[PDB]
Design a protein around this ligand. Structure first.
Ligand code: 2ER
Ligand code: NA
Length: 241
């Protein structure tokens, strides 16, 4: 499936650029209109929607639960949400607000003992392991936010039933240069029991086509949709052919 993505800061749909320390900088504001954007995405056939709560990421005390509740209610397609999910209570709050899947990167690589417990409480279908991948000079898929590889972390969670992984090539985020096809070809084949979502870099319709047959189950598209490189409708018809 095609998975359209929005970044949210205090109710605003934003463009950000990832910085060194896991930090980032706000580039563009697209508007204060997340719900109509999501409804248009759904109307065009998007089967899943992706939201990153950057406000909650900075400060979990400020998680945008009331907004998320409204956004989930206002469409009839499942929404997955990430952003500074740190505790079992955070996961529960998001599911209670009507989120279909909770997306977790930082806490999952930092505190595997804790997050394993979440798998056992909520079940594997409720949780998406998000991997912020940096390929180093040696070819290692680094995912720390000492080092941790993609493979090491996937293996960490397979025993508690890991099924969904969002694999972001963070150097590709917002570049419009294409997603990392070879990376997805490799990891999808290595873990055929896992449903990988690709993320970062989609630039034009050819880039969607290029991920067909890689094994990727979901293609996250952010910037290209926001800046009208193509519509959700045509992304879907490319992806489904
Ligand atoms: N500074 C950041 O931007 C950022 N930091 C963490 N995440 C993710 O937040 C989640 C939870 O992280 P954590 O549990 O808080 O550590 C993890 O997945 C982290 O990887 C980010 N992603 C934000 N938007 C991503 C987005 O809108 C589309 O994916 C992107 O525009 C698609 O690429 P494209 O435009 O099409 O090139
Ligand atoms: Na689709």
């Amino acid at each position: 499936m095609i998975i359209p993505a929005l970044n949210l800061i205090g109710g605003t749909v934003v463009r950000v650029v990832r910085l060194h320390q896991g930090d980032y900088a706000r580039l563009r504001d697209y508007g204060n209109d997340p719900l109509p954007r999501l409804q248009d995405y759904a109307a065009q056939g998007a089967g899943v929607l992706h939201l990153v709560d950057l406000t909650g990421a900075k400060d979990p005390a400020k998680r945008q639960i009331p907004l998320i509740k409204t956004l989930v209610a206002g469409v009839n397609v499942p929404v997955q949400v990430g952003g500074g999910v740190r505790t079992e209570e955070d996961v529960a709050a998001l599911l209670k607000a009507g989120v279909a899947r909770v997306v977790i990167a930082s806490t999952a690589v930092k505190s595997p003992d804790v997050v394993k417990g979440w798998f056992e409480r909520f079940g594997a279908q409720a949780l998406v392991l998000a991997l912020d991948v940096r390929i180093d000079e040696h070819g290692t898929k680094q995912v720390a936010v000492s080092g941790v590889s993609l493979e090491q972390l996937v293996e960490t969670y397979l025993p508690v039933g890991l099924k969904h992984v969002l694999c972001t090539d963070i150097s590709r985020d917002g570049t419009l240069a294409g997603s990392n096809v070879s990376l997805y070809e490799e990891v999808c084949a290595r873990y055929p029991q896992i449903a990988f979502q690709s993320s970062g870099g989609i630039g034009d319709i050819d880039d969607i086509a290029a991920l067909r047959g890689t094994g990727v189950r979901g293609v996250i598209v952010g910037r290209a949709l926001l800046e009208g490189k193509f519509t959700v409708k045509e992304a879907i018809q490319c992806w489904q052919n």
